[PDB]
Amino acid sequence: QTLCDQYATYSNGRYTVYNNLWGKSSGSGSQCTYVDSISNSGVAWHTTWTWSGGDNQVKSYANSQVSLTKKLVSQISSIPTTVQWSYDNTNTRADVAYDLFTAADINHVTYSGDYELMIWLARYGSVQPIGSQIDSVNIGGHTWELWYGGSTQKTYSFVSATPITSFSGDVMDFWDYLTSRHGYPASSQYLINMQFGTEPFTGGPATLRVSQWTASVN
Numbered sequence: 632q633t634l635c636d637q638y639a640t641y642s643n644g645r646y647t648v649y650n651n652l653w654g655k656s657s658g659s660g661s662q663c664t665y666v667d668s669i670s671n672s673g674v675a676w677h678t679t680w681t682w683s684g685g686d687n688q689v690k691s692y693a694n695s696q697v698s699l700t701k702k703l704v705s706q707i708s709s710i711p712t713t714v715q716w717s718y719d720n721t722n723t724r725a726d727v728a729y730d731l732f733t734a735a736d737i738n739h740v741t742y743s744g745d746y747e748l749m750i751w752l753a754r755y756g757s758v759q760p761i762g763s764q765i766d767s768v769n770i771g772g773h774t775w776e777l778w779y780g781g782s783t784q785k786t787y788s789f790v791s792a793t794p795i796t797s798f799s800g801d802v803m804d805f806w807d808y809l810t811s812r813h814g815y816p817a818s819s820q821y822l823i824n825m826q827f828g829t830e831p832f833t834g835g836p837a838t839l840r841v842s843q844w845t846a847s848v849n
Contacts, residue, residue, distance in 0.1 A: 632665075632666050633665055634648065634649070634663065634664040634665065634666075635650065635661070635662075635663040635664075635735060636650065636672050636778055637650065637652045637653075637655060638650065638651065638652070639664070641666050641669075642677075643666075643669045643670075644671060644698075645671050645697065645698050646668075646669055646673070646674035646695055646696065646697060646698070646844075647695065647696045647698070647709075647813060647826075648664060648666050648669075648674065648676045648693075648694070648695050648696075649664070649692075649693060649694050649695075649696065650662060650663070650664040650678070650691070650693050651691055651692050651693055651694060651828075652690065652691040652693075653691060653692065653742075654685075654688055654690045654691055655690055655691065656686070656691050657688035657689075657690060657772075658682055658683055658684030658685040658688065658690055658833070659682070659684050660677075660680065660681045660682035660683055660684075660690060660831075660835070661678035661680070661681060661747065662678060662679065662681075662682070662690075662691055662693060662831070663678065663679050663680075664678040664679075664693045665678070667789070669677060672787060672845065673710055673750035673843045673845040674754065674761065674841070674843075674844050674845075675841060675842055675844070676695055676841050676844075677783045677838055677839060677840040677841060678693040678724040678828075678829065678838065678839050679836060679837070679838040680831050680836065680837060681834075681835035681836045681837075682831045682832065682834065682835060683833055684833070684835050685832075686696050686724070686741050686832060686833055687758075687795075687832065688832065688840055689727040689805070689830045689831070689832060690830075690831050690832065691831060692700075692730065692826070692828050692829070692830050693828050693829060693839075694730065694826040694827055694828025694829075695828065695841065695844050696824065696825065696826045696828055697825050697826075697846040697847065697848070698776070699822065699824075699825060699848040700848065701821045701822065701823050702819070702821060702822060702848070703817070703818060703819070703820065703821055703822075703830055704733060704806050704810075704815075704817040704818075704822055705817040705818040706719065707803060707806075707811075707822060707848060707849065708800035708803075708849045709801050709847075709849045710801055710803050710806075710825070710846070710847070710848050710849070711769075711799075711800075711845075711846070711847055711849070712729070712798075712799070712801075712802060712844075712845060712846040712847075713798065713799045713843070713844075713845050714746050714752070714798050714827060714841065714843065714844045714845075715796065715797050715798075715841070715842045715843050716752075716796055716839060716840060716841045716844075717796055717839075717840050717842075718753075718755075718823060718837055718838070718839055718840075719837065719838050719840070720753075720834070720835065720836065720838070721755050721794075721837075722756075723755045723756055723831065723832075723833070723834030723835060723836065723837050724755060724756030724757060724758045724831075724832040724833045724834050725755045725756065725758065725829060725831045725834065725837070726751045726753060726755070726758060726760075726829065726830045727751065727752045727753040727756050727828075727829050727831060727839065728749050728751045728752065728788075728827075728828070728829070728830060729748075729749065729750040729752075729802070729825070729827050730738045730747065730748075730749055730768075730823075730825075730826045730827070730828070731747070731748040731749075731753065731777050731802065731822065731824060731825045731826070732744030732746070732823050733745060733746045733748075733820040733821060733822050733823060734820065734821060734823055735819050735821070736821075737793045737821045737823070738739065739744040739821075739823055740825050741824040742824070743784055744784065744823060744824070745784070745820060746784070746785050746786075746787070746815070746820060747781070747784055747785070747787070748787050748789075748802075748805060748806070748809070749761075749786065749787070749788040749789070750775075750788075750802070751788060751789065751790040751791060751797075752791055752794065752795040752796070752798055753791065753794035753795065753835075754790055754791070754792070754794075756833075756834070757770050758831070758832050759768075759778075760778040760780075760786070760788035760790060761778065761781055761786040761788060762778050762779045762780015762781060762786060762788075763778065763779070763780060763782040764776055764777065765777050765778065765779050767781075768789070768808065770789065770804050770805055770808050771800045771801070771804045771805075772845075773791060773795065774791075774792070775789035775791060776788075776789070776790040776791075776792065777789055777790075778790060779813075787809060787813070789805060792846065802825070822848060825846055825848060827841070827844050827846070828845055841843075
């Protein structure tokens with residue numbers, strides 16, 4: 632499908648793709664998302680955007696999403712994921728990131744949570760995560776900046792200083808890290824959403840091509 636409207640979506644079984652221009656009112660621009668291939672083994676998609684204004688506000692988060700059974704984080708065995716992606720124009724202010732939400736209420740809305748976990752595989756330009764940097768950490772064979780902030784929604788962001796365009800990992804390593812070292816309440820939080828996509832601030836035109844994304848919550 633071709634997805635140019637603000638909340639356009641396409642789903643086929645296990646994976647869903649969204650245009651998700653939730654922050655378009657913060658600036659001026661436009662964005663279209665496209666599904667290239669979709670199956671039980673993974674999804675390929677791309678999104679093209681130009682954005683200006685509201686320099687420190689995210690304009691959108693076009694993304695692919697994996698279907699999951701909502702489970703306590705303490706009961707999840709593994710969250711394997713692999714992704715291959717590229718940007719054609721990197722002279723932008725944007726990130727490429729996983730986004731996960733957890734909540735104590737299993738029926739919480741899925742686009743927010745008690746906690747948000749972001750894993751930024753790339754940071755372009757003068758943009759920064761929510762909150763402030765609290766440390767540099769080593770997880771899964773990579774060094775990450777760890778950021779924390781937010782009020783009603785507590786957001787932890789793990790940021791790679793160098794773009795990782797071919798990534799494989801287990802997101803449970805990041806939940807384990809927060810559980811062990813930052814008191815994250817894994818035994819009372821349900822994982823309710825897992826997504827991968829890009830947050831534009833300003834720039835463009837730029838096309839994120841995701842040649843394959845796979846994920847599973849086990």
